[PDB]
Design a protein around this ligand. Structure first.
Ligand SMILES: [Mn+2]
Ligand SMILES: [Mn+2]
Ligand SMILES: [Mn+2]
Ligand SMILES: [Mn+2]
Ligand SMILES: [Mn+2]
Ligand SMILES: [Mn+2]
Ligand SMILES: [Mn+2]
Ligand SMILES: [Mn+2]
Ligand SMILES: [Mn+2]
Ligand SMILES: [Mn+2]
Ligand SMILES: [Mn+2]
Ligand SMILES: [Mn+2]
Ligand SMILES: [Mn+2]
Ligand SMILES: [Mn+2]
Lengths: 190, 190, 190, 190, 190, 190
């Protein structure tokens, strides 16, 4: 009913997205950027979507292009899946406490495309989250949220009230977006 | 069931209000102040009220008296329609993203009459919103929210987290009040 | 007994004033500037004068000249009506709370012509109060009080202790002047 | 002629108020909070009311609820006793010097419900006035004046110009309200 | 179904807690500290729990130990009653306007034990709330929220956005925790 | 009825005071300090007293001792003339605009002896008012008001809100005291 399959082939990367807005958290994400995978998994799960993200890109350069194309593709999927947006709550918001971190997100699904991202500590503009694979530069958080809002055609305001740990700050934000989205997309019985 | 008709005749103006708390957004507002109409329409609609506002006043002086009498009358209607306030959610809140603006409202419907309005940029104390008709001075926003809370006998806290455009700042606030109200008035199944 | 009729014909405007100091608030003001009318009505009423103000002027330029000629004419009327000022209270003062606003006025009716106006928020130097007619620039408040004091030959000190709304700030001041005047003009039984 | 009997039964407390606006200072106050009693006695006396306040409440918690219910009940009594407010002075104000303290109050009895409380030294936000009985936290001063104004439907502005002693600061304020009220409620011979 | 009985015997105090998460606000609290009772009653009621708290302690020293043991015991009860936390909303938040005060709370019920308490005015670090019985030092607010979160094994973030009255600041916080908790514990139909 | 004759013989000076509180402004002052005479004349006149002040002192030193003994003697006269202070207004206040100056005074006639003098520009601490005779050092203003309050056993608060001219600042203050006194001493019909 509220589904979308988006394929996005660029010079930089290759994306397939399958999205059901009315899902049960059946989520599989594989972008070649394992922390991004973890964030998008949290996103799909906490928004109660069913979501498959499969992506390959110029990860030898860094994660930027792949992260960005995926977020654009995902936004496009969200917009198409929403259709005419009839009889939905439209507005949604969620607070996410994650240890010392508090993040928040608010959405207007029928509002014109817009993103404002505030409150994220300055050290995230140059922080790297790195494991045994391709690393994730947290400076991209903003870029992800902007690409989502611009391609879904929605108003998306994301806040960090406070926080210290970059993994917590980042995850709380993604989870915040997820549950704001979840509340917004739900049918309104009025 | 939860309805009220209020007539308010002053020297300055003439108000009729018809209010159903359990409506479907059937809203008709005509106060002779077209931006106020637009705000009260957004209010009635987003609160899921059925609302008729019909008002005429000394608009040759300016909109103040008409805007104020209407808000008093509307508050009085809200209070009467609420009755004894039995088995309702009582507390409500809503975030409204509107482009660059984020506004918020929280209500306690059984709390004593009180209004606090914070965060609105300073230039709204002397901003005019003007078309081909009677203009709207945004300095009145505060006055409207105070008159509502005082005459409905409710706690109403309205915040602007940030914003630039006076139409957006103002509308987000009215919409914020509306959805905070909507959540609060709903029956609680507990 | 304490009456005066003043006619004032200038190039800019045309004023007729009828003033009874010992009135009952029978007040009719028509200057072509509806907010000024509202202020002068509050003035006449709250001072317990009987007052007729009829004025036409170069309102296509703006209200300044008409507002100013009227205030001069009204001051002249006040002075003439007062006569030799024998056996009157002479001193008067009044506090006017108007919602968030507190204004105050003090007068010495036998003191030499003098006006001091303090405490009015800065944004009133460029605020406009506008309806469906000729607008009122609040920067003129000072000018009105000065013209009154200078032409009535009285000491008039007008204060705003605090306030936010320009309509409230302005009206409280006019009402403050009115009741200060009322107390001052009353016969002293000593 | 201008009387009211108000009974107020809440979960927190039990209030009976008998009020004659045109009294001779026949005042009896018993709320279980002896400093509050002393303040309300000063209020009734200095306003030249005849006043009986009898109150019992959850004073084991602290005085807040009892103090608040009493002030609400008293405000309601003031409003009802005032009736249509015909031919009264309407405006009133009073300065109260009390040793090193100067306090002031101004009222508009026909003005919409509003309270502004300014100038009280910061240490009163956490000062306790304590004897052999239930103590009085001066932070409640504001709360009392707000409850009065809101339930009497009057404009009430209360100022401390300066002061040091918390008993003096508090008492001067209550006395200030009292005499402002007294002047306002008096018949106007005009 | 979601119940717990906790007995806690320390050298300092003696606590029995009975908790039903799926209650109707049947709440009875008796700790020998009447303001604490009032706060815990508001907590149980506004969270829609059924709650019995019975506590005796070394109240001759002061309320600290009793307040702390009770909060630990209550946290332990909350954790046990929650069980495996299957199919619940998990996240919850609530704004509480209480006159001039605005407080907020957000919870993650499956998040690791953590508490952050911000925004409470400085004077609450040394404010006493006192009646005819054992007094309540508001500096303990933090301590209560920390003990709750640590023993329930939950993330609990409590904010005061602003406020003046210590009774209002404190109560709004407890009520905020209550409704955040209520939303979080509710079954999720997804 | 309310009269007093006070004789005060010190080493420094010689004072006779005759005071009728219920006078018509029949005032004769001769202290050998002509500006003091002018101030005390304004005082007696504006308070509607009948007052005779006759004083000689060590004016070769300067006016201080004579000014001070006279003010003490006058205070003593005021206190004795007031008697038991039965059925009087008790509280009084007056604003005095004098050109650019605004001064104010408030009194409590039954309050314990106290004086607070604020707002007087700093240059009055070393300003001299001089003619063809014995000069007047304005630093004495404070001293006069203190001696009055201490010897009349009254609360007397004197303010300068603003002012420039030392003759105006000083005279407005004396006149302010006078009319505050006048209002206070008047019979209260309640
Ligand atoms: Mn990019
Ligand atoms: Mn993680
Ligand atoms: Mn208004
Ligand atoms: Mn917030
Ligand atoms: Mn719009
Ligand atoms: Mn001019
Ligand atoms: Mn003042
Ligand atoms: Mn008006
Ligand atoms: Mn309260
Ligand atoms: Mn006392
Ligand atoms: Mn401890
Ligand atoms: Mn309480
Ligand atoms: Mn000396
Ligand atoms: Mn002079």
């Amino acid at each position: 009913s509220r589904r979308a399959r988006i394929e996005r082939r660029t010079r930089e990367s290759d994306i397939v997205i399958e999205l059901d807005l009315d899902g049960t958290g059946q989520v599989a994400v594989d972008t070649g950027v394992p922390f991004y995978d973890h964030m998008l998994t949290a996103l799909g799960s906490h928004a109660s979507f069913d979501l498959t993200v499969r992506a390959t890109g110029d990860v030898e350069i860094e994660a930027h292009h792949t992260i960005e194309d995926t977020a654009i593709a995902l936004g496009t999927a969200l917009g198409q899946a929403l259709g005419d947006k009839r009889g939905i709550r439209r507005f949604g918001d969620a607070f996410i406490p994650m240890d010392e971190t508090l993040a928040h997100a608010a959405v207007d699904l029928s509002g014109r495309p817009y993103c404002v991202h505030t409150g994220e500590p300055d050290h995230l503009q140059h922080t790297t989250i790195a494991g045994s694979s391709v690393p994730y530069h947290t400076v991209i958080n903003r870029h992800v949220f902007e690409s989502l809002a611009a391609n879904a055609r929605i108003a998306l305001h994301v806040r960090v009230l406070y926080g210290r740990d970059p993994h917590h700050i980042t995850e709380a934000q993604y989870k915040a977006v997820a549950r704001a989205l979840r509340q917004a997309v739900e049918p309104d019985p009025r």
